Write a protein that binds this DNA or RNA. Structure first.
Ligand SMILES: [Mg+2]
Ligand SMILES: [Mg+2]
Ligand SMILES: [Mg+2]
Ligand SMILES: [Mg+2]
Ligand SMILES: [Mg+2]
Ligand SMILES: [Mg+2]
Ligand SMILES: [Mg+2]
Ligand SMILES: [Mg+2]
Ligand SMILES: [Mg+2]
Ligand SMILES: [Mg+2]
Ligand SMILES: [Mg+2]
Ligand SMILES: [Mg+2]
Ligand SMILES: [Mg+2]
Ligand SMILES: [Mg+2]
Ligand SMILES: [Mg+2]
Ligand SMILES: [Mg+2]
Ligand SMILES: [Mg+2]
Ligand SMILES: [Mg+2]
Ligand SMILES: [Mg+2]
Ligand SMILES: [Mg+2]
Ligand SMILES: [Mg+2]
Ligand SMILES: [Mg+2]
Ligand SMILES: [Mg+2]
Ligand SMILES: [Mg+2]
Ligand SMILES: [Mg+2]
Ligand SMILES: [Mg+2]
Ligand SMILES: [Mg+2]
Ligand SMILES: [Mg+2]
Ligand SMILES: [Mg+2]
Ligand SMILES: [Mg+2]
Ligand SMILES: [Mg+2]
Ligand SMILES: [Mg+2]
Ligand SMILES: [Mg+2]
Ligand SMILES: [Mg+2]
Ligand SMILES: [Mg+2]
Ligand SMILES: [Mg+2]
Ligand SMILES: [Mg+2]
Ligand SMILES: [Mg+2]
Ligand SMILES: [Mg+2]
Ligand SMILES: [Mg+2]
Ligand SMILES: [Mg+2]
Ligand SMILES: [Mg+2]
Ligand SMILES: [Mg+2]
Ligand SMILES: [Mg+2]
Ligand SMILES: [Mg+2]
Ligand SMILES: [Mg+2]
Ligand SMILES: [Mg+2]
Ligand SMILES: [Mg+2]
Ligand SMILES: [Mg+2]
Ligand SMILES: [Mg+2]
Ligand SMILES: [Mg+2]
Ligand SMILES: [Mg+2]
Ligand SMILES: [Mg+2]
Ligand SMILES: [Mg+2]
Ligand SMILES: [Mg+2]
Ligand SMILES: [Mg+2]
Ligand SMILES: [Mg+2]
Ligand SMILES: [Mg+2]
Ligand SMILES: [Mg+2]
Ligand SMILES: [Mg+2]
Ligand SMILES: [Mg+2]
Ligand SMILES: [Mg+2]
Ligand SMILES: [Mg+2]
Ligand SMILES: [Mg+2]
Ligand SMILES: [Mg+2]
Ligand SMILES: [Mg+2]
Ligand SMILES: [Mg+2]
Ligand SMILES: [Mg+2]
Ligand SMILES: [Mg+2]
Ligand SMILES: [Mg+2]
Ligand SMILES: [Mg+2]
Ligand SMILES: [Mg+2]
Ligand SMILES: [Mg+2]
Ligand SMILES: [Mg+2]
Ligand SMILES: [Mg+2]
Ligand SMILES: [Mg+2]
Ligand SMILES: [Mg+2]
Ligand SMILES: [Mg+2]
Ligand SMILES: [Mg+2]
Ligand SMILES: [Mg+2]
Ligand SMILES: [Mg+2]
Ligand SMILES: [Mg+2]
Ligand SMILES: [Mg+2]
Ligand SMILES: [Mg+2]
Ligand SMILES: [Mg+2]
Ligand SMILES: [Mg+2]
Ligand SMILES: [Mg+2]
Ligand SMILES: [Mg+2]
Lengths: 200, 61, 96, 85
RNA sequence: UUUGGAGAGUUUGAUCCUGGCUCAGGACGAACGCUGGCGGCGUGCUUAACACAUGCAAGUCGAACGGAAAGGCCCUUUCGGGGGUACUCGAGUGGCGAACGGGUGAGUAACACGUGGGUGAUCUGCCCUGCACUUUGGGAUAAGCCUGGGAAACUGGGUCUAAUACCGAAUACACCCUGCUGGUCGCAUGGCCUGGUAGGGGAAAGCUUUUGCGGUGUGGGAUGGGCCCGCGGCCUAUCAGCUUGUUGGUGGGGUGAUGGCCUACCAAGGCGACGACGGGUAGCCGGCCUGAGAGGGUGACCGGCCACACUGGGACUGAGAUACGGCCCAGACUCCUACGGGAGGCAGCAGUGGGGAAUAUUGCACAAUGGGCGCAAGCCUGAUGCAGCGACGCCGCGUGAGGGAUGACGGCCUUCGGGUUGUAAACCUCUUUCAGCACAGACGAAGCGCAAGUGACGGUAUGUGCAGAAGAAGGACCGGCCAACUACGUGCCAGCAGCCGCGGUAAUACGUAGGGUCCGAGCGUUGUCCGGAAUUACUGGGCGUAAAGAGCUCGUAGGUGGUUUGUCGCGUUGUUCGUGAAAACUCA
């Protein structure tokens, strides 16, 4: 199941922008609640939980399968933090969101659930696809005729496509080439506290 | 062994089949068990809507 | 007469049949002396691989395969090799 | 007994017990006579009884009532006792 | 040359130490409370090894034999049916199969179990493969007919018939035994060169005329098996001596095979403080949970073994008996009776009564594969493949999206200004996964048949269409630990509660409200187990007073050694091939 309640509540309580263009946040950064002014006592667990929640709702990932993320990252021989960030950025949802074919990660998930795309010529209608390397992601004719996808493809003029990701032309073919690196990704927050909380 | 009666109101009279769970109680020295509500003949006390699950109460309608 | 069995493991809705050469006296899942492969129809190709040399040694030593096992061996061409009539025929559809 | 197969098996087994008990009793009587001859202390009659008993022992063993190596065992043990006395 | 360690609270006026208790996590064959939509994939009596209504879960061969109850055919017919027909067949032998596969864990501390040898000490039908033979005579019984007892099961008496059912004899001279003579090996009697020698002994059965199968012994091998072997593998000395076939020798008997397996006589010993025998506990193991690790716990499923079949015993059948639905006897349980006597054994699949928290359906198929049968077709198989029930466990999906006010109600607080739920809501566009309704629609079957066809699952999985945001969200917590606060209502009551502790009128701790937090089709409680617990301290504790050095000595066993000169290398590591089942974990 996904989140059906308000989405701006998340940013308001979290104290940082999630989508990026929040007028309501900039109008009132204080987290909701009749006591959004009470001073918050320092707590290492508190901050670890804060970081965990922010990352989880930022990526739309469910709690259990993101624990699965963390354990899988431990399993891989590389460093746990960058392994986790790699495996969570590999999400087809994040791929479409950051390739300019989805305005928001939630909309990418909605479209994938609708099943309007072809991956390597095989129909797929699952959000959490594992986008390997060298792969190719397509979009099919009914998706093309769909209006909002057209708008997104002409609106992909935001923060430019990251290094390993790129779009080749009007058909919007997305292909990944090399290994994303933490420094170039510059995904926000620090994996230190996430790994600490899950190693608790 | 004695058992503790949760909630606020109860319908228990002598010779009433009941269900019991495990739990210590410090106020009562000779007590070490609770009695679940909403099972068998023990129902949850009416007028409860907060922590409804713990006491076995239905929703509003 | 030890016969070529198809050992079965796993769960209900997807049976597994490993190719085992064993005596029929034991359980259907009983003692497996030597394994040479497995067979599972759940997948549409239901790919099967056979070790020709081991199969032939067992046949020459006295293990009589069960009819489906022999048919599958003909399919893989091991029966053809053992008979020497057509030779060794390779037509197995390796999975796409 | 609740199946025709098992009941028929019990019939056949009783028949073959009648048969096998007969044969085994004959063999035991042969061995008993041989023993009596030996503790009496004769030589030629002992040898002739050895011959007859061995012939019938081999017949029974080939029939399958008793088993070959043990048949050889007691026949050779009896031969050893004879040669000892 | 690579993988991998969290603390917090609680003693005191206030510290520090030690130490005790509790919590933050994973996991359940888990149960209850609330909630609840689908699909995919597993899982599902842990207690009463309690008794069990019904039925299913073991059958195959006329080309072995006699026959014809029912059917097919033809001669006949008064329609009672009469002959043969072998297509076919009831039962009748004979076989083969039934020791399979399925179930359960009460006992069992044992060579019971994993691993490592084994046997010059055993067997083993059905399979293939080189290699002699299968002559001959005889008799009986079922079935059937008649009779009799008897409700009954069951039984007898008499006549009659055949054989892959039965036995004698023919041979064997390569096999099993015994009295005489060489070489090889040594790990020993002695084994192997079928070592040579003399004696005597021994087996079979036929079927089909077509991819033709049968019977008997043993140079080759395998499998299933038995025996015993080092090691090992709970707790209790508040269990210290136990044991008499017990311990060894010789001789006999016995076993498929040595051996107190059994018997007789000899000697008195054997086992015992590097824990005997005693007591309670409990199937062992590959494994499952935990832990960085060592280690701790534990034995769900699957799987390798063990033992059991209403309780106690015993034996037959054979290559194979603990013989689950094989036999006999004794007790219990239930039932039948015409009262003489009989039937029984769900822990086989399901199902019910009871216990309990609780574990589902009296479902379909041989479609595929294993398994039993046959020359095969072909038959049987709750093994199975599947289907229905159940949020119980891992995993994926749906109940919308985009924008939308210096932000519409209304609630709740207010310092009466206002904040607050809130991009939320209604609103304008969109896709509408999945459910709903239709079409197409697989493979799972180079598989079988000398036949034309063979799929339960399912008309499902899977694609394509139709109208519709339309059918879709709840649970726990919010005093500190512990990310989440305020007001309303009663105040040592009513109550909360994990530890500390919270109410004696103005509670962030009770209840109500809002608001917030965690989680989520699951959320909590409870209970078992690991952890932090270095809180049984090998890694890795302490002994002055916090708990501990006995009151102090000699000294047996055990434990331990002040030096160098010397070998064997049994303590040791050194490497090479040579075992470590599958399944599970780690890498791709
Ligand atoms: Mg940890
Ligand atoms: Mg079995
Ligand atoms: Mg295929
Ligand atoms: Mg067949
Ligand atoms: Mg019956
Ligand atoms: Mg007699
Ligand atoms: Mg006698
Ligand atoms: Mg015999
Ligand atoms: Mg002997
Ligand atoms: Mg002797
Ligand atoms: Mg690691
Ligand atoms: Mg304290
Ligand atoms: Mg103190
Ligand atoms: Mg203090
Ligand atoms: Mg329900
Ligand atoms: Mg399911
Ligand atoms: Mg299931
Ligand atoms: Mg038959
Ligand atoms: Mg017939
Ligand atoms: Mg048999
Ligand atoms: Mg049997
Ligand atoms: Mg059996
Ligand atoms: Mg089982
Ligand atoms: Mg059971
Ligand atoms: Mg048991
Ligand atoms: Mg013992
Ligand atoms: Mg062995
Ligand atoms: Mg056999
Ligand atoms: Mg003859
Ligand atoms: Mg007769
Ligand atoms: Mg005649
Ligand atoms: Mg003869
Ligand atoms: Mg002769
Ligand atoms: Mg001779
Ligand atoms: Mg010769
Ligand atoms: Mg014959
Ligand atoms: Mg050994
Ligand atoms: Mg050992
Ligand atoms: Mg002796
Ligand atoms: Mg001897
Ligand atoms: Mg002995
Ligand atoms: Mg003696
Ligand atoms: Mg046991
Ligand atoms: Mg282990
Ligand atoms: Mg550890
Ligand atoms: Mg450890
Ligand atoms: Mg264990
Ligand atoms: Mg198994
Ligand atoms: Mg097992
Ligand atoms: Mg074994
Ligand atoms: Mg028993
Ligand atoms: Mg038995
Ligand atoms: Mg049985
Ligand atoms: Mg029975
Ligand atoms: Mg029974
Ligand atoms: Mg059953
Ligand atoms: Mg009950
Ligand atoms: Mg019950
Ligand atoms: Mg079959
Ligand atoms: Mg035959
Ligand atoms: Mg044919
Ligand atoms: Mg049948
Ligand atoms: Mg049938
Ligand atoms: Mg099923
Ligand atoms: Mg269930
Ligand atoms: Mg439930
Ligand atoms: Mg899901
Ligand atoms: Mg919208
Ligand atoms: Mg097909
Ligand atoms: Mg085909
Ligand atoms: Mg589809
Ligand atoms: Mg469709
Ligand atoms: Mg609460
Ligand atoms: Mg907090
Ligand atoms: Mg707090
Ligand atoms: Mg008050
Ligand atoms: Mg409260
Ligand atoms: Mg809230
Ligand atoms: Mg623990
Ligand atoms: Mg210590
Ligand atoms: Mg002290
Ligand atoms: Mg002292
Ligand atoms: Mg003293
Ligand atoms: Mg060496
Ligand atoms: Mg070596
Ligand atoms: Mg090795
Ligand atoms: Mg393997
Ligand atoms: Mg692991």
């Amino acid at each position: 199941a996904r989140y059906t309640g308000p989405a701006t509540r998340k940013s308001r309580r979290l104290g940082v922008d999630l989508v990026g263009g929040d007028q309501s946040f900039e109008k009132r950064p204080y987290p909701p609640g009749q006591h959004g002014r009470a001073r918050i006592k320092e707590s290492e667990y508190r901050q670890q939980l804060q970081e965990k929640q922010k990352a989880r709702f930022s990526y739309g990932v469910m709690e259990k399968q993101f624990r699965r993320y963390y354990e899988e990252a431990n399993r891989q021989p590389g460093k746990t933090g960058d392994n986790l960030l790699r495996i969570l950025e590999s999400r087809l949802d994040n791929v479409v969101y950051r390739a300019g074919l989805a305005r928001t990660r939630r909309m990418a998930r909605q479209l994938v659930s609708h099943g309007h795309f072809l991956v390597n010529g095989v129909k797929v209608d699952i959000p959490s696809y594992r986008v390997s390397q060298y792969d190719i992601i397509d979009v099919k004719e009914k998706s093309l005729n769909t209006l909002p996808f057209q708008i997104a493809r002409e609106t992909a003029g935001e923060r430019p496509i990251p290094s390993w990701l790129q779009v080749v032309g009007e058909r919007q073919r997305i292909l990944v080439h090399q290994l994303p690196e933490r420094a170039q990704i510059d995904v926000p927050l620090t994996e230190q506290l996430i790994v600490e909380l899950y190693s608790k | 062994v004695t058992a503790y009666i949760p909630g606020e109101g109860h319908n228990l009279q002598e010779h009433s089949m009941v269900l019991v769970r495990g739990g210590r109680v410090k106020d009562l020295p000779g007590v070490r068990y609770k009695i679940i509500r909403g099972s068998l003949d023990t129902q949850g006390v009416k007028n409860r809507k907060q922590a409804r699950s713990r006491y076995g109460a239905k929703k509003e309608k | 007469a030890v016969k070529i069995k198809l050992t079965r493991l796993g769960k209900i809705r997807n049976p597994q049949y490993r190719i085992i050469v064993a005596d029929a006296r034991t359980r259907r899942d009983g003692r497996a002396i030597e394994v040479i492969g497995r067979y599972h129809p759940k997948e549409e190709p239901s790919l099967i691989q056979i070790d020709s040399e081991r199969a032939q040694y067992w046949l020459g030593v006295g293990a009589q395969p069960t009819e489906p096992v022999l048919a599958l061996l003909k399919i893989t061409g091991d029966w053809q090799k053992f008979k020497g009539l057509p030779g060794a025929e390779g037509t197995l559809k390796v999975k796409e | 007994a609740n199946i025709k197969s098992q009941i028929k098996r019990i019939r056949t087994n009783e028949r073959r017990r009648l048969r096998n008990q007969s044969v085994k009793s004959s063999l035991r009587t042969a061995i008993r006579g041989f023993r009596e001859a030996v503790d009496a202390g004769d030589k030629d009659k002992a040898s002739e009884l050895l011959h007859a008993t061995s012939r019938k022992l081999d017949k029974a063993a080939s029939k399958g009532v008793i088993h070959p190596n043990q048949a050889a065992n007691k026949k050779s043990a009896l031969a050893l006792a004879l040669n000892k006395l």
